[PDB]
């Protein structure tokens, strides 16, 4: 007997435990939206005495917690199921409520819903249903168990008219199962009256899984009041069983001087509610106010890159054996190609990536104008010298790295790559020099150092020592003097026609629509239209005086376009006295109705309220 009715005002609860008085504190949390569909689900298993195959007990998703209200006599509804598929592939829970006990536990049972539903199990003949669980019939690795006191206080309201209105709110944000609840029998029989009542907390404990679906435990050996039907499409049918789905909303909440919640408003229902939320009060005087600011959102995305094809020789530069010395390195330039950065870090994790400006994961999307590659082998200890502003024996006379270096430096061990019993005398480094090296140039020079006041003419005697020192590697010594093959990738982001991009698909060119565009790395959103500009053959980008791009030539079509921002403006609410009327009149600042406010579409208008037919 599924049915659909209105929820009205229901679901307010204390979000914390601190005491407050005469405060208008506002919060942003999971709540039950005002005036929402509340649907009576109905697990239907009772008819005479026979089996009555029913295919009922539908899987109810546990979406952002659930609001559960009930008027249950004693124990017909007992417990609940949370988990995924309840088998030996995903962890499962067990939450069963005794008379006064709780037996929550964790297990991976494949099947547990076999309580041997009897033919004579109808309560009209006998209501005896004890230990009708037959749960965790299988347990491969089930260890996490738990016991505690009952959550619901099983109290009888001594009559059916003033039945015990039982309310729970279930949420599992970062573990710590919340069971905020409240009992109230004041209702005289009707469903969901008008009023206010906050809900107190009970307990919270952490377990941790992707809990996905929900279903209450019924007394499978004692059932009644569930007739068979297929009611739907906003109808009415007795079920004695409720459900409600929460959403993350912002609420304004008032506290009585005793400390009890008295009233609350949801900021995202009515322009009047928005006005009441913006200024902290429940009465708004006649006038005009500002509430929010709407803006149209993009509908899709497009990427257009040149038609370049060719794999950059990153394999050639990385894999080699005849790298030269530190003082005399080698420089290489990357030509027009597309570069696959996946093999750099996703494979062969030898040493740290040591990124400085760009992150390795954020690669393969941005595009570059040129790439430099340098290779040398150094001290294992001198690795830290390769960093901006860092000084050392080689950081001043062998290799200087600029302050604002961008890109990454790649190094890996070379114990096998370079080890001679007699030592390696083919590796050199400059030791003495007149001045500190400016970044990125060579100081190679065949000359004898002149120290003191001895003008050596090639004597190379006292106070005249060779600046280049034969490094002399070792095959058996420990780390540090062990060889480290070092390569450095130097990028630059210069506003020029891009040369080397990542691997991306070039989609079609849409126009006259609010879309997201990426023209060789110019991220942004707007409406691409025709342009009448007179771009010269070497011109690439247009510009207004803001350092803001407003004209882009198509890369693979050689056609210029115009870029315009999305429709944008503020929102105003015109209302009379709040004690005179409740109607309003929304003003959309500086926009034409024909552009977009003539109708609201799904997720295309920041103001949530759309109570107008527009």
């Amino acid at each position, epitope marked *: 007997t599924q049915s659909y009715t209105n929820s009205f005002t229901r679901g307010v609860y204390y979000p914390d435990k601190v005491f407050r008085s005469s405060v208008l504190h506002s919060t942003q949390d999971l709540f039950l939206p005002f005036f929402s569909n509340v649907t009576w689900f109905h697990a239907i298993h009772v008819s005479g005495t026979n089996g009555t195959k029913r295919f009922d007990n539908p899987v109810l998703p546990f979406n952002d917690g659930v609001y559960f209200a009930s008027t249950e006599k004693s124990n017909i509804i007992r417990g609940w199921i949370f988990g995924t598929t309840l088998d030996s592939k995903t962890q499962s829970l067990l939450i069963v409520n005794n008379a006064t006990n709780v037996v929550i536990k964790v297990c991976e049972f494949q099947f547990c819903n076999d309580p041997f539903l009897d033919v004579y199990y109808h309560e009209n003949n006998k209501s005896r249903m004890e230990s009708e669980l037959r749960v965790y019939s299988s347990a491969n690795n089930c260890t996490f168990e738990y016991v505690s006191q009952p959550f619901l206080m099983d109290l009888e309201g001594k009559q059916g008219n003033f039945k015990n209105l039982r309310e729970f709110v279930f949420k599992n944000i970062d573990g710590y199962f919340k069971i905020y609840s409240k009992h109230t029998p004041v209702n005289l029989g009707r469903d969901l009256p008008q009023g206010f009542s906050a809900l107190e907390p009970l307990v919270d404990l952490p377990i941790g899984i992707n809990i996905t679906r929900f279903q209450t435990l019924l007394a499978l050996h004692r059932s009644y009041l569930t007739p068979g039907d297929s009611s739907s499409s906003w109808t009415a049918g007795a079920a004695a069983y409720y459900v409600g789905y929460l959403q993350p909303r912002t609420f304004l909440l008032k506290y009585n001087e005793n400390g009890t919640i008295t009233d609350a408003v949801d900021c995202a229902l009515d322009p009047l509610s928005e006005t009441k939320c913006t200024l902290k009060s429940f009465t708004v005087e006649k006038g005009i106010y500002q509430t929010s600011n709407f803006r149209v959102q993009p509908t899709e995305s497009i990427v257009r890159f040149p038609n370049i094809t060719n794999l950059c020789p990153f*394999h*050639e530069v990385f894999n080699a054996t*005849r790298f030269a010395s530190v003082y005399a390195w080698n420089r290489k330039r990357i030509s027009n190609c597309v570069a696959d950065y996946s093999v750099l870090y996703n494979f062969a994790p030898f040493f740290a990536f040591k990124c400085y400006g760009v992150s390795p994961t954020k690669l393969n999307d941005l595009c570059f104008t040129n790439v430099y590659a340098d290779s040398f082998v150094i001290r294992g200890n001198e690795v830290s010298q390769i960093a901006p502003g860092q000084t050392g024996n080689i950081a001043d006379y062998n290799y200087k790295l600029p302050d604002d270096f961008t890109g990454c430096v790649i190094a890996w061990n070379s114990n096998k790559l*370079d080890s*001679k019993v007699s030592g390696n005398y083919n590796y050199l480094y400059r030791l003495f020099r007149k001045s500190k090296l400016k970044p990125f140039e060579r100081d190679i020079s065949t000359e004898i150092y002149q120290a003191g006041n001895k003008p050596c003419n090639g004597v190379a005697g006292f106070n005249c020592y060779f600046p280049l020192q034969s490094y002399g590697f070792r095959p058996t010594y420990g780390v540090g003097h062990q060889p480290y093959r070092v390569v450095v990738l130097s990028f630059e982001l210069l506003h020029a026609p891009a040369t080397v991009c990542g691997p991306k698909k070039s989609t079609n060119l849409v126009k006259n629509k609010c879309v997201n565009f990426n023209f060789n790395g110019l991220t942004g959103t707007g409406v691409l239209t025709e342009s009448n500009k007179k771009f010269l053959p070497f011109q690439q980008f247009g510009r207004d005086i803001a350092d803001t791009t407003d004209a882009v030539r198509d890369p693979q079509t050689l056609e210029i376009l115009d870029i315009t921002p999305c429709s944008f403006g503020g929102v105003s609410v015109i209302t009379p006295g709040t004690n005179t009327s409740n109607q309003v009149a929304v003003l959309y600042q500086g926009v034409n109705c024909t552009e977009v406010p003539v109708a609201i579409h799904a997720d295309q208008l920041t103001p949530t309220w759309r109570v107008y037919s527009t």
Partner: antibody
Framework: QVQLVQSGAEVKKPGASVKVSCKAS????????ISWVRQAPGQGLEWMGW????????NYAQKFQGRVTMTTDTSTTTGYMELRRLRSDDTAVYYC????????????????????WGQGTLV | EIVLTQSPGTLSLSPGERATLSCRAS???????LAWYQQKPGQAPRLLIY???SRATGIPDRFSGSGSGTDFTLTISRLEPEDFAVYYC????????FGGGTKVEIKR
């Protein structure tokens, strides 16, 4: 996920040339070169040759200068061996391997050996 | 050029005994030149050791290597006789020439 396959056995008379196709798939045929090597019973292998991807640069040994000229087709993704001036008893198995010892553009040698080999063509 | 010289003439050992292999060169081979292969009968070569002690195709517990400069040695412990492949060694720094080789028999 290397895929290297070779054609069947071939017999050619002296004075002609032997053309054998080595098909490569599953890996990009530009990161590493392909080395062709020869094996005969009772003895090890040699430095028959190594072939690059984009151009004709090679690392031919000092034994067979003037004859060793193979080709590669990146469109066909096939290494073609076209050994000319056949010798009387050149009958031996040929292995095309994804080499890890020679570099393509600037000619600098690599590190290691021959990781993945071919299935072998017997002539 | 330089041709390798091998004198592990016969590995006449039963499974379970230690096996040692040597690949002494002529005059010098630098440590950045090493390759080792198993030549199974009627099969294709495959790389096992491309350096000092690294792994190419699995190598759970058997293929080990060490050495420095003029000496290089390969060690096998607890050998399982399914392979009985030829131990081939190769240097790279001085041109390229495969080693003599060493057949591995069963010793029934």
């Amino acid at each position: 996920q290397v895929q290297l396959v070779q054609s069947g056995a071939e017999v050619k008379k002296p004075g002609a040339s032997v053309k054998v196709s080595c098909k490569a798939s599953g890996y990009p045929f530009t990161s590493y070169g392909i080395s062709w090597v020869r094996q005969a019973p009772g003895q090890g292998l040699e430095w028959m040759g190594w072939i690059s991807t984009y151009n004709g640069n090679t690392n031919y040994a000092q034994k067979f200068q003037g004859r060793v000229t193979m080709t590669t087709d990146t469109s066909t993704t096939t290494g073609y061996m076209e050994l000319r001036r056949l010798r009387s008893d050149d009958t031996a198995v040929y292995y095309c391997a994804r080499d890890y010892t020679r570099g393509a553009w600037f000619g600098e040698s690599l590190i290691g050996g021959f990781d993945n080999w071919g299935q072998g063509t017997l002539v | 050029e330089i041709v390798l010289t091998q004198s592990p003439g016969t590995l006449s050992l039963s499974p379970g005994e230690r096996a040692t292999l040597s690949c002494r060169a002529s005059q010098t081979v630098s440590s950045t030149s090493l390759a080792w292969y198993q030549q199974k009968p009627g099969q294709a070569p495959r790389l096992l050791i491309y350096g000092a002690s690294s792994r190419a195709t699995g190598i759970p517990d058997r293929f080990s290597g060490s050495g420095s400069g003029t000496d290089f040695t390969l060690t096998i412990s607890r050998l399982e006789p399914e392979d009985f492949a030829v131990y081939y060694c190769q240097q790279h720094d001085t041109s390229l020439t495969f080693g003599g080789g060493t057949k591995v028999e069963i010793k029934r």
